[model samples]
Target: ITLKVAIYPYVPDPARFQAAVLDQWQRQEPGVKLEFTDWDSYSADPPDDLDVFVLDSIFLSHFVDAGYLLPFGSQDIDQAEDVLPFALQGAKRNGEVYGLPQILCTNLLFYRKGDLKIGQVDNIYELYKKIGTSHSEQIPPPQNKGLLINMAGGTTKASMYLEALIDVTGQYTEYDLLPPLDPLNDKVIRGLRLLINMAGEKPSQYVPEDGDAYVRASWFAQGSGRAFIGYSESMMRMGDYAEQVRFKPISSSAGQDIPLFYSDVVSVNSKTAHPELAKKLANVMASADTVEQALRPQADGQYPQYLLPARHQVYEALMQDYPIYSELAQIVNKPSNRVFRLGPEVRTWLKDAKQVLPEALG
Candidate 1:
């Protein structure tokens, strides 16, 4: 018998998936061998033959509307009780959960402890002096050492801009992304204006002329940058720089710490012939066992611990093994800190933040 599963493009290294999930599933359940298919993370329609879909919680509405989803209340997704309440909440629509949070994604402000304090960097003048781009652009010998950013354009530009907007705007959670907009509001203006001006002066002195995370991360690690704004998983690749690296939630001039937070949800294809088996497989793949396995060392010496697991226990286990995961765990524990708890909907509407924001900044 064939079991068709549709996975997402964002599940990290394939070897990590195979080792932590597929190997175990193949060994124990040989009767219904798995055949995997895939689709874009932002797509509206899931493929037909897919018995299991590595779902996104953000798309719960469309999936439920199409009857292509099975609500958790109707299924035996008992493992959900142990997951983080905030992340799990993202998958719920109309009061019933439709997906299981498998992984977490967030944007954080990364800085060297010696350079700036998290909540203490307080004012606009301080941020300007600290980022120091104007100084670098105007001064002798070009400091080459200020804000470490990925303004090189394409998809990466929106991250910092959005984080900035939400921070000043005081993102009120309870939606997919962009805390119910009014981009014209004062809060949003503060955010956009800040970034526009920052990106205003910010563009001139970016490290290595051509911009990218590589140049940013490497620059912060040893070159000459003092601060950086990057995604959650960014810390891992920094490796040794991990020692001095510290993080704080994105804060605005309003003195609010509003970070953008999200989770990758796992669910079953309601149309699959093997709904029972699909539920079982989805539960198993997202189980604490698989998440724990992914966190273990691989052949390449990389521990697939870049993402934070949805289940609190798995995250707890990660904290025990490596102290780093604990930082983000602490961040999520405080929901009061977030500005926008993103939904899959952001995938559809926020393309302007991706394109227009960068072009305007430039």
Candidate 2:
């Protein structure tokens, strides 16, 4: 028997999953084989033969509304005790859980230890003001300190736009967790401009046009920039500098650290033929043991997978071996709001933003 699986693409190391997670599954079910498929978030539907898959928490509402997911009740999940609150919440709809939480992340402001206390600052603007920097966007010839971010695509810029909408206008939820954003609103423009300024409001050598978090984080590690604006998991990409780097949740202009936290969930396809096997595979994928193996450092010199784990037990158990996991727990558990679904129109919004963002920056 064969089960098809597709994990998230953005994970720092896909090879680790194959060796640590899938290899273990192969040992448990000797006769069962696993096939893989590439997942495209823009795809309108799941592949017909796909058995189990990973879903971004942002798409949870959309998948449930469309009946694309198989719901998992409390009894269905094994060892459900230590999953983080938001991780579990993000996978639930109405009264039923649609998936098992795996990993989670949010936007974080990475700064050097001595730069400033990021938590005490109200927002990015306030943080910049406290640092006493005139050039908040890009590094100048004489001054090498500035913000680094990935604004290379419409989807990314659109996500940032939504964050700004929630923070700037207090207009995120209106029936849906997110309302269709207006391109012409003054407040929307205000928020976009703020982000543009952070991106240097123009092109530069230090500021990358690529959206890859690893690329951005690696650059920051090399001293290309002083501060970085990227996801919590991007911390893992810093190599040895991971120890020296400090991060805090990027706050809104209004002082709310409304974490635009993103989560990945293990889900079985609604139409899968191998229900029992698929559920079994999903359980393993979400298990803390699997996560520990997938994330633990392979050797003494290797960096620990700094990706945030969904299980509290995974954090505690791994913290002894990887000290960075302790910092990760604080960031994930900090008081914050939930990340909302952007719905199908999300792609359209991104396309529109891609067009508008260039003009606005110019």
Candidate 3:
């Protein structure tokens, strides 16, 4: 039996991983043939030849919604024990872990040492006040005046809205469900209003050179904002310069008990010819050793910039280099109640997000 897979190199080096993982996977299963391919984005009409998709957790929704993914059963997965805390949250729907948690990635608050000091961030109010002082001239901007954030963008923008709503639930909705019944609830409106007030057209926050993310890394290497919201690994791209900044889970408000996060997963194809074989190969790739070798390579003297792992052991290795992983476990594992929400309505939520966002800031 042969398992056909789609591999998106989201890492710096794809060929190195694609060749290594495929060859290793073959060695493990002499009876099964595993084939892998890489493509940036699926076309209008996607080819149905793949048996597994080794990609982000967010994409599972699209496949699941389109009936393109096969749901896993207790018999289908045996390594759930090796998986990390928040790993399964992204791909879950109803009650099933639609996709297996593989890589651990999140939007972190990346700030310079003196800029968005970690200990100083008490709540969203303190963060906004700090940003206003850093960017707005009324209070007289700092030596480097501007806040670095993604406001007008697509994916990041949507996550921003989702996280805000998640934060609002904690701050305003002790009794209400998230994705709040009233998008216009006072707390909801308050969240969007803060985002609006923070949205700056001119050096408001240090936006990357352009949508080219690498450039954002380059700018962060040379640019300054109180702090920036970016992937946990964006600092890896900056190498030594990244040392000036710190990475921490973002809190939407001062009193919000749990933080919100975003992540990706690896999934098997529902329509594949080899269902049993696909699940086996998919599980095989989920091994801690494979993750360390294939998906966990370090980038230019640092932990791989691509992503972190969903396995505790691998992350413990990261904790060796950076103490943050010690706390990372708390954030990564046992994600908050916010984990199951968002994703499906990210883009759709923006229709309402924009109505109150930049508009309410004023």
Candidate 4:
């Protein structure tokens, strides 16, 4: 059987664990032949001969809605139990599973443990008080560096930050407000205002480059900033730079911990010539051994979906190998509490927000 798969290339280390997993799968299943293609190329015109299409959460809806992806049932997603739930939810539409999760990604707050003396805060109002004004000159910012946010060329970073605010405030999907704007509408505005203020107050305090996720991560790792928002994978990849790094879930104005995670899933091309083989491969990819193999090295690492593993044995084994692994895993394994979809019009709205936000806030 031959399978042509599409995988997105976005992470800094493309050769990390993915290559190893593919090699293992190939070795284990000699009868299967796999052809991998970068997302950019495969998306242009899905090869008619391809059997599977792997997509990140952002693009899954596109292919699924375009009638390009086949739907899998709850039985098909049974193995995904060990993966994150929110990620699985993101991949599902109208109740059917359209893909298998490949990786789990979430935003976490990195702060210096004792810098600003604000412990775990749940509300934006408290966070504002802690970083915006509560700290003394000698105490410096919460993380010793000033708070930094993304306010560069596009509004993606800002938008993601806004989502976090909405998640934390428990208003992610509400649409009612003073003018009936929306539920949690104030939270979104608060997040945006926070970013604008960060940029306007001290441009040097924050990194303003177009793709500043890494730069922002570095600043937090180096203790240059009191706190910053970034993906969990980044904190793991920081290595030596993560010495001063401490992880906290995204916070709300109520001073509670709220973590926002994103993930990618693998889907069989509805147009594929080999649906059974594709299904087999997709099932194998979600198996316990495969997930274990993928997550073992970085025990505190990310997984693709939201289901708990059959047992705690994997986590128990991980605890023995990595000290912080359990802590990270505990956080990841916790109920996701909130799940979000970019909506069919997400891309358009994002583009519009990018143009409208800065001008509106400025």
Better model by TM-score: candidate 2 vs candidate 4: 2
Candidates in order have lDDT scores of 0.61, 0.70, 0.57, 0.55
Residues 4-95, candidate 4: write the lDDT tens digits: 76554555444433664476667667787887766552135345666665555555555666777789877666456565566566677767
What does candidate 1's lDDT look like per residue over 36-107, in tens digits? Answer: 775665654677777776754555566766677877774577556797777666677778877777777765
Give the number of the best model, judged by TM-score: 2
Report the lDDT tens digits of candidate 3 across residue range 1-362: 66677665555456655665676687788877766665442221125887777755444455566677778887777667667545564556656777776666666766676753544665556667676533353321233444455454434444455556556666422111226324445565576456546535444333445444544454555764445656765765776776676666656655655654444456776768778777777776666666666644434543455466677776777666655555656656654633324344333454565555555444
Kindly give the stretch of ten consecutive residues in candidate 2 with the minimal lDDT sum: 134-143
In order of appearance, the predictions have TM-scores of 0.79, 0.88, 0.76, 0.75
- Would you list the clashing residue pairs of candidate 1? 58-344, 145-224, 176-342, 176-343
lDDT of 4 at 200: 38
Q: Cα RMSD for candidate 3?
A: 4.8
Candidate 4 has a TM-score of 0.75
**Which number leads on lDDT?**
2
Model 1 lDDT on a 0 to 1 scale: 0.61
Question: Which prediction has more favorable TM-score, 1 or 4?
Answer: 1
Q: Model 3 segments beyond 4 Å from truth? A: 8-20, 30-35, 38-47, 55-62, 114-118, 133-143, 171-199, 202-211, 295-303, 321-327, 334-362
